[PDB]
RNA sequence: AUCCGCGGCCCU
RNA sequence: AGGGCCGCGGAU
């Protein structure tokens, strides 16, 4: 099944032709409306004796299972055949059978380079706002439009699907003006070839009483540090390095990176190694502002404890280790004794007293370490009388959670966990949510709306914990203004005259199509260790397996490293990782490449960037 | 146990 | 260009 009255008006144009976008406020239940267009569609095709299909593209693999089980499957189980997919089955073959297909976005893209658009009848799109020139989803929409222009020439026919997009909500990317904001929304319609945004107007009251917004709240605040800065300054005079920017902040952090890069090139030890150590100290200062002082210390302890094993000694590491390990006892002492220290502690407790048990809670924080550090802060410090969730991608030297392990935490939340701490935001379902605090996190107007929509119902409160300065609050205000600005922008395009709207939308389409004219895409090098200048591998000695893993099997290389699997230099600088098949792989980042033609040392972040091709194995 | 490639969003 | 964060795909 059944559609609520407000959801009927938004679905009416989609029901007959008229490819549209559907944007309804968060918590509206708008994935359900998509199911109704599908039923309407397929049933209509059987009567017309024409084929039926639906591709239902999504941004998350976890949404594939979630959408299937909750929305599309249970209603359509008897009538039509539904399949979710992200297990070693051929894609053109699933398309043969199975009236409805819920797939990860890229999975289709892969097969458009076989299966074509012409086969599919209707396309359903989760979070349309990702649609842009830059990314999935998608390039696929430009394939649809490119095919469409082909039809414009024929008239002067190949069948094209109906496109039903679903987003809350398009938003204005990075544009303060009211004029430019509209330009983004015309672009979003242009890429989706949708006729109108089709918001909810006639039934607006029905909704407002059904789904309520959280009241935005505000919390603000305004020894270890001076101890630590003292250490860094002495390290600075050791190398005769003057940054000119204050310690414990980003512009200074970026200067320390750039200094290490150039130091690898000139091959001067003490200049680079210190800078790497400085990056580590600076990290402690910047986290100490936003996180418990024990974590500031722990970040440095584990760093140094790992440096003893890597090493097992030159004058530099001795100056640094001796300097830290004498002060090690001191810092741990300062860490465990209680501005920044007290932050938000009251905030959750106020929510626990009001309602019987604060059954739901959600925190948002910038960094992965902060999620784990806060959770550990909340597990301790009972009586109250909490768990963390983080992403799957691999960077920063933290370990991603398993996708199933994430699925575990939400299912445990549906019950053992009262409060979760995440940077993931949109696309995962939580109900009965109230507090939803954002801790030091800015993001953009679209992430704000998705996150805000977490907590409903009822009486929900949306809180921002901020530093006095540099404030997040100034960036948050502008986000809100833009949230409000998108609505007026979504208004302009609906009441724009059809003759104008269609004429201009084409110029956005032909422009996006004409755009891609571009091209998509060996003994000349010698690799040196970056910490220390020693020949590691000449360029012949590297090999490639399956076009991906860059490996050195040359027995000479075996001599140069130690293990523990992780590969490390004589010096102790990490070199690579040991992958086992029945092959050692090395990260480019740990080496500095010397060009032969004239000696120039360039350093690379990843393998693809360097022009030379390597021999396959 | 990771690798590899691609892409978004932030901030300087 | 950096760092942080998020995600998809192809590997073993
Ligand atoms: N038309 C409907 N009639 C009855 N229940 C509905 C309807 N639509 C959604 N629901 C319920 O709402 C739940 C899912 O919708 P909801 O959690 O509010 O987010 P949603 O479908 O993701 N909307 P959105 O976040 O804006 O994409 C389901 O458990 C349904 O029980
Ligand atoms: Zn070395």
Read out DSSP for A184-205?
HHHHHHHHHT-S------TTHH
Atom of ligand 1 nearest to the CA of A33: 1
Question: What are the distances in angstroms from CA A82 to CA A68, A72, A87, A364, A443?
Answer: 8, 8, 16, 35, 36
CA–CA separation, A176 vs A479, rounded Å?
9
Whether the CB-CB separation of A428 and A417 falls below 8 Å is answered with: no
CA–CA separation, A180 vs A244, rounded Å?
38
Angle separating helix axes A178-192 and A498-515, nearest 10 degrees: 70
Which positions on chain B have an atom < 7 Å from some protein CB? 1-12
- Distance (Å) from CA A29 to ligand 1 centroid: 3
Angle separating helix axes A272-290 and A293-311, nearest 10 degrees: 160
CA–CA separation, A319 vs A535, rounded Å?
26
Whether the CB-CB separation of A512 and A133 falls below 8 Å is answered with: yes
- Residue positions forming the annotated binding site of A for Zn(2+): 529, 532, 569, 571
CA–CA separation, A441 vs A465, rounded Å?
9
**CA of residue A401 relative to chain centroid, distance:** 14
Whether the CB-CB separation of A109 and A158 falls below 8 Å is answered with: no
Hey, where are the domains in chain A?
1-211+470-521, 212-222+339-469, 223-338, 522-617
Class of domain A1-211+470-521: alpha beta
Q: Which residue is nearest to nucleotide B1 (CA to C1')?
A: A579
Closest nucleotide over all strands to A441 (CA to C1')? B10
Question: What are the distances in angstroms from CA A610 to CA A445, A525, A588?
Answer: 37, 10, 10
The pair phi, psi for residue A304, each rounded to 5°, is -70, -40
Whether the CB-CB separation of A149 and A90 falls below 8 Å is answered with: no
Length of chain A: 617
Neighbouring CB atoms inside 10 A of A425's CB total: 16
Closest CA to A284 of A249, A321, A241: A249
State this model's resolution in angstroms: 3.6
Whether the CB-CB separation of A462 and A434 falls below 8 Å is answered with: no
Contact flag, residue A552 CB and nucleic strand C, below 7 A: no
CA–CA separation, A323 vs A20, rounded Å?
65
Token couple for A93 = 């073959």
Q: Where are the alpha helices (DSSP H) in A561-603?
A: none
3-class secondary-structure state, position A579:
coil
Sort A468 into a burial class: Cβ within 10 Å, 0-12 / 13-18 / 19+.
exposed
| Per-residue DSSP letter, A214 | P
- Neighbouring-strand partners of residue A351: none
Residue located nearest, by CA, to atom 8 of ligand 1 = A29
Strands (E), A119-186: 122-126, 162-166
3-class secondary-structure state, position A234:
helix
b/e burial code for range A322-348 (CB count within 10 A of at least 16 → b): eebeeebeebeebbeeeeeeebeeebb
Q: What approach was used to elucidate this structure?
A: X-ray
Whether the CB-CB separation of A202 and A9 falls below 8 Å is answered with: yes
**Statement: A212-222+339-469 belongs to CATH 3.40.50.460:** no
- Distance (Å) from CA A4 to ligand 1 centroid: 11
3-class secondary-structure state, position A103:
strand
**CA of residue A146 relative to chain centroid, distance:** 29
Q: Is the minimum distance from the CB of A168 to ligand 1 under 6 angstroms?
A: yes
In terms of phi and psi (left: phi > 0; alpha: psi -120 to 50; beta: otherwise), the region of A295 is: alpha
- Distance (Å) from CA A26 to ligand 1 centroid: 9
| Per-residue DSSP letter, A133 | T
Q: Is the minimum distance from the CB of A314 to ligand 1 under 6 angstroms?
A: no
Whether the CB-CB separation of A193 and A128 falls below 8 Å is answered with: no
Instruction: Examine residue A169 and say whether the peptide bond preceding it is cis (omega within 30 degrees of 0).
Output: yes
Contact flag, residue A393 CB and nucleic strand C, below 7 A: yes
Domains A1-211+470-521 and A212-222+339-469 share a fold: yes
Pocket of ligand 1, candidates A32, A60, A456: which has the most ligand atoms within 8 Å of its Cβ, to mutate? A32
Ligand nearest to the CA of A36: 1
Closest nucleotide over all strands to A88 (CA to C1')? C10
Whether the CB-CB separation of A324 and A403 falls below 8 Å is answered with: no
CA–CA separation, A86 vs A107, rounded Å?
7
Q: What protein residues sit with their CB closer than 7 Å to strand B?
A: A 130, 132, 134-136, 173-174, 250-251, 254, 393-394, 399, 442-444, 447, 470, 475, 547-550, 577, 579, 585, 587-588, 606-608
**Statement: A223-338 belongs to CATH 3.40.50.300:** no
Q: What's the 3-state SS for A383-441?
A: CCCCEECCCCCCCCCCCCCCHHHHHHHHHHHCCCCCEEECCCCCCCCCCCCCCCEEECC
């Amino acid at each position: 099944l059944q559609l609520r009255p407000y959801q009927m008006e938004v679905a009416q144009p989609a029901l007959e032709g008229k490819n549209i976008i559907i944007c309804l406020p968060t918590g509206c239940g708008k994935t359900r409306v998509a199911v109704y267009i599908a039923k309407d569609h397929l049933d209509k095709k059987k009567k017309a004796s024409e084929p039926g299909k639906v591709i239902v593209l999504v941004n998350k693999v976890l949404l594939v299972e979630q959408l299937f089980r909750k929305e599309f499957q249970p209603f359509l189980k008897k009538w039509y055949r539904v399949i979710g997919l992200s297990l070693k089955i051929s894609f053109p073959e699933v398309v043969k059978s199975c009236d409805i297909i819920i797939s990860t976005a890229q999975i289709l893209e892969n097969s458009l380079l076989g299966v074509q658009l012409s086969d599919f009848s209707l396309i359903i799109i989760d979070e349309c706002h990702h649609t842009n020139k830059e990314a999935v989803y998608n390039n696929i929409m430009r394939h649809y439009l490119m095919q469409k222009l082909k039809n414009n020439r024929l008239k002067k026919v190949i069948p094209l699907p109906q496109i039903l997009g679903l987003t809350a909500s398009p938003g204005v990317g990075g544009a303060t003006k009211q004029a430019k904001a509209e330009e983004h929304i015309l672009k979003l319609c242009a890429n989706l070839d949708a006729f109108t945004i089709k918001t909810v107007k006639e039934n607006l009251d029905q909704l407002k009483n059904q789904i309520q917004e959280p009241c935005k709240k505000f919390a603000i605040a305004d020894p270890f540090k001076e101890k630590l800065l003292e250490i860094m300054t002495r390290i600075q005079t050791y190398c005769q390095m003057s940054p000119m920017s204050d310690f414990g902040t980003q512009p200074y952090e970026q200067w320390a990176i750039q200094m290490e890069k150039k130091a690898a090139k000139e091959g001067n030890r003490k200049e680079r190694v210190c800078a790497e150590h400085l990056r580590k100290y600076n990290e402690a200062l910047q986290i100490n502002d936003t996180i418990r002082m024990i974590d500031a210390y722990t970040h440095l302890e584990t760093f140094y404890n790992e440096e003893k094993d890597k090493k097992f000694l030159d004058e530099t590491d001795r100056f640094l280790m001796t300097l830290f390990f004498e002060n090690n006892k001191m810092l741990k002492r300062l860490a465990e004794n209680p501005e920044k220290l007290t932050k938000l502690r009251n905030t959750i407790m106020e929510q626990y007293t009001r309602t019987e048990e604060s059954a739901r809670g959600i925190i948002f924080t910038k960094t992965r370490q902060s999620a784990y550090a806060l959770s550990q802060w909340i597990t301790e410090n009972e009586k109250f009388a909490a768990h963390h969730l983080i992403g799957a991608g691999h960077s920063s030297e933290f370990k991603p959670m398993t996708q199933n392990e994430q699925k575990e935490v939400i299912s445990k939340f549906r019950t053992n966990l009262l409060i979760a701490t995440t940077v993931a935001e949109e696309g995962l379902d939580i109900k009965e949510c109230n507090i939803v605090i954002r801790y030091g996190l800015v993001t953009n107007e679209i992430a704000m709306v998705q996150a805000r929509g977490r907590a409903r119902a009822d009486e929900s409160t949306y809180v921002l914990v901020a530093h006095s300065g540099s404030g997040v609050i100034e960036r948050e205000t502008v986000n809100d203004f833009r949230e409000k600005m998108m609505y007026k922008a979504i208004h302009c395009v609906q009441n724009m005259k059809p003759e104008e709207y269609a004429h201009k939308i084409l110029e956005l389409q032909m422009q996006s199509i004409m755009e891609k004219k571009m091209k998509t895409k060996p003994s000349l090098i010698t690799f040196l260790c970056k910490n220390c200048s020693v020949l590691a591998c000449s360029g012949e000695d590297i090999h490639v397996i399956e076009k991906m893993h860059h490996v050195n099997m040359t027995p000479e290389f075996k001599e140069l490293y130690i293990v523990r699997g992780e590969i490390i230099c004589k010096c102790g600088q990490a070199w690579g990782t040991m992958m086992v098949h029945k092959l050692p792989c090395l990260k480019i980042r740990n080496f500095v490449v010397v060009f032969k033609n004239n000696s120039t040392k360039k350093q690379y972040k990843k393998w693809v960037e360097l022009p030379i091709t390597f021999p396959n194995l």
